Structure formats: C-alpha cells, structure tokens
Amino acid sequence: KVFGRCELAAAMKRHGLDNYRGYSLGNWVCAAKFESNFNTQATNRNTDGSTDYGILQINSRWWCNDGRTPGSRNLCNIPCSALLSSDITASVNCAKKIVSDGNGMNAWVAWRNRCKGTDVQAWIRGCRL
C-alpha cells in the first residue's frame, strides 16, 4: 500500500504515535516520507547486509527477523515480512520500541538528516484535525 499523507497521519495518530516519547505526528509522517515514500512494501538492503522494511524502514539487524542477517536480535519479535502489510500496526508497535531505546528518533537516519529541526507540522497541514 502507498498511503496518502493525511491517510498515514490519521493511521499513525490512531495507533498512538502523535506525541509518543514526545514526538509530534508531523515528525513521524516526515520520517515515513523520506524512509519509504509512504509505501508499506518498501524494502532496502543496508551495506552491513541487513535490510530495512516497510513504512518506517525497520531494520533486520536489531528489530525483526528476516533469516539472512547474521546477528539479528529480533527485538520486536516479528518476521520482517509482517512489517510490509497494508495495516501498519506491527510497524507502529515496533517503532515505539525503537524510539524508546535511548536515542529517540535519531534512530531513523533519514529523520535525523532531513526532518529534525524542520517545520515538521507542515506534514500534517490540511489533514482533519
């Protein structure tokens, strides 16, 4: 599924991400844009041989199991393929674990380089308040 911008924002707000660990909804939508372009099926291999999965490009090194990442912890206790569903529930519950882990949303390098410090509430502009 390719989510629309306000569509994704309403799904993330309904699953509890607006203001989670102090991060406003605009932050999470901005990260989803530059991680996956709102595409739940997006996958991208990392140079260390792990792969990132889904809307928020959750990485198989630490968070989900894909069977091909020597060392994987699978801390969200989830197959990485289940992060590619049209229903973002698994991805949101796992992202809640990642942002809570110590370095906040800086865990998403795309958030740190392209979203952090920017007017992120522009990402929920026009969406039903």
Swiss-Prot record:
Q: Which reaction does it catalyse?
A: Hydrolysis of (1->4)-beta-linkages between N-acetylmuramic acid and N-acetyl-D-glucosamine residues in a peptidoglycan and between N-acetyl-D-glucosamine residues in chitodextrins
The answer, when asked if Signal is one of the entry's keywords, is yes
Q: What is its EC number?
A: 3.2.1.17
Q: Which residues form the active site?
A: 35, 52
Query: Which GO MF term does the entry hold, naming one?
Result: beta-N-acetylglucosaminidase activity
Task: Please give the positions of the paired cysteines in each disulfide bond.
Answer: 6-127, 30-115, 64-80, 76-94
Q: Which family does it belong to?
A: Belongs to the glycosyl hydrolase 22 family.
The cellular location(s) given in this protein's UniProt record come to: Secreted
* Tissues in which the protein is found: In the egg white and polymorphonuclear leukocytes.
Provide the primary localization. Answer: secreted
The record's annotation in SUPFAM superfamilies points to: Lysozyme-like
> How does this chain assemble?
Monomer.
SMART domains listed in its UniProt record: LYZ1
Q: What does this protein do?
A: Lysozymes have primarily a bacteriolytic function; those in tissues and body fluids are associated with the monocyte-macrophage system and enhance the activity of immunoagents. Has bacteriolytic activity against M.luteus.
Q: Which GO terms describe its biological process?
A: cell wall macromolecule catabolic process; defense response to bacterium; defense response to Gram-negative bacterium; defense response to Gram-positive bacterium; killing of cells of another organism
**Miscellaneous information on this protein:** Lysozyme C is capable of both hydrolysis and transglycosylation; it also shows a slight esterase activity. It acts rapidly on both peptide-substituted and unsubstituted peptidoglycan, and slowly on chitin oligosaccharides.
Q: Which UniProt keywords apply?
A: Allergen, Antimicrobial, Bacteriolytic enzyme, Disulfide bond, Glycosidase, Hydrolase, Secreted, Signal
Gene this protein is translated from: LYZ
Q: Which CDD domains match?
A: LYZ_C (cd16897)
Its Gene Ontology cellular component terms are: cytoplasm; endoplasmic reticulum; extracellular space
Q: What is this protein called?
A: Lysozyme C
What InterPro entries does the annotation carry?
Answer: Glyco_hydro_22, Glyco_hydro_22_CS, Glyco_hydro_22_lys, Lysozyme-like_dom_sf
Q: Pfam families recorded for this chain?
A: Lys (PF00062)
The C-type lysozyme domain covers 1-129
Q: Where does substrate bind?
A: 101
